[PDB]
């Protein structure tokens, strides 16, 4: 198991004409491995569909992942904006 | 560290032979000295003056020398040409 590997490669031909959305050096960084997509960094460990209680085949499509993201209500945000000035 | 020492600068004879100061010994903002303006307590800000950076550059290293009821004042003149 090695730690001090390079894991970064840049092609010498500069085709930096229409490339401004990627991660530039400031050239294009090319890794040895792909990227990973994480939807929400917070996990609601309640919400008993995930915790599976032992009391009582059912399908249910919940609206959006934001149930599992601890999203606050807009009234507290409006109250904090009223407390801002 | 980062302290300027007290001694070992004696750039005096080059100012005696600088040919611009009013010295009759040898023949052959807008202020010059920052004794009224601050440098924000930084040493490098003293290097912008030409009469001080000349002292820092053209200095030399010397060695320290170690050594009646009515006074009679007699003026003594001196006039000797040499080299």
């Amino acid at each position: 198991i090695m730690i001090d590997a390079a894991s970064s490669f840049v092609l010498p031909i500069s085709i930096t004409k229409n490339v401004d959305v990627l991660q530039r050096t400031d050239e294009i960084l090319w890794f040895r491995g792909p990227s990973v997509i994480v939807n929400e960094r917070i996990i609601n460990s309640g919400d008993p569909h995930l915790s599976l209680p032992l009391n009582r085949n059912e399908k249910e499509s919940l609206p959006g992942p934001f149930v599992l993201g601890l999203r606050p209500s807009a009234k507290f945000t409006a109250h904090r904006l009223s407390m801002l000035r | 560290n980062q302290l300027i020492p007290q001694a070992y600068i004696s750039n005096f004879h080059n100012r005696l032979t600088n040919e611009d100061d009013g010295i009759p010994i040898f023949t052959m903002g807008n202020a010059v000295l920052p004794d009224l303006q601050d440098q924000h307590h930084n040493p490098f800000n003293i290097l912008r003056y030409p009469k001080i950076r000349d002292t820092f550059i053209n200095g030399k290293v010397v060695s320290p020398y170690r050594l009646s009821g009515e006074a009679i004042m007699i003026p003594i003149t001196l006039d000797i040409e040499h080299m």
Binding site: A6, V10, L11, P12, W30 | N1, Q2, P43, F44, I57
Partner: peptide
């Protein structure tokens, strides 16, 4: 296009941990 190997960019851990960013301190004339 398959003969276009690139240049590796090293980590330089001793230059990654605590490198800073001497005539500026007046002690060497």
């Amino acid at each position: 296009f398959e003969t276009m190997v690139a240049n590796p960019i090293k980590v330089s851990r001793l230059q990654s941990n605590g490198v800073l960013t001497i005539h500026y301190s007046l002690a060497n004339f």
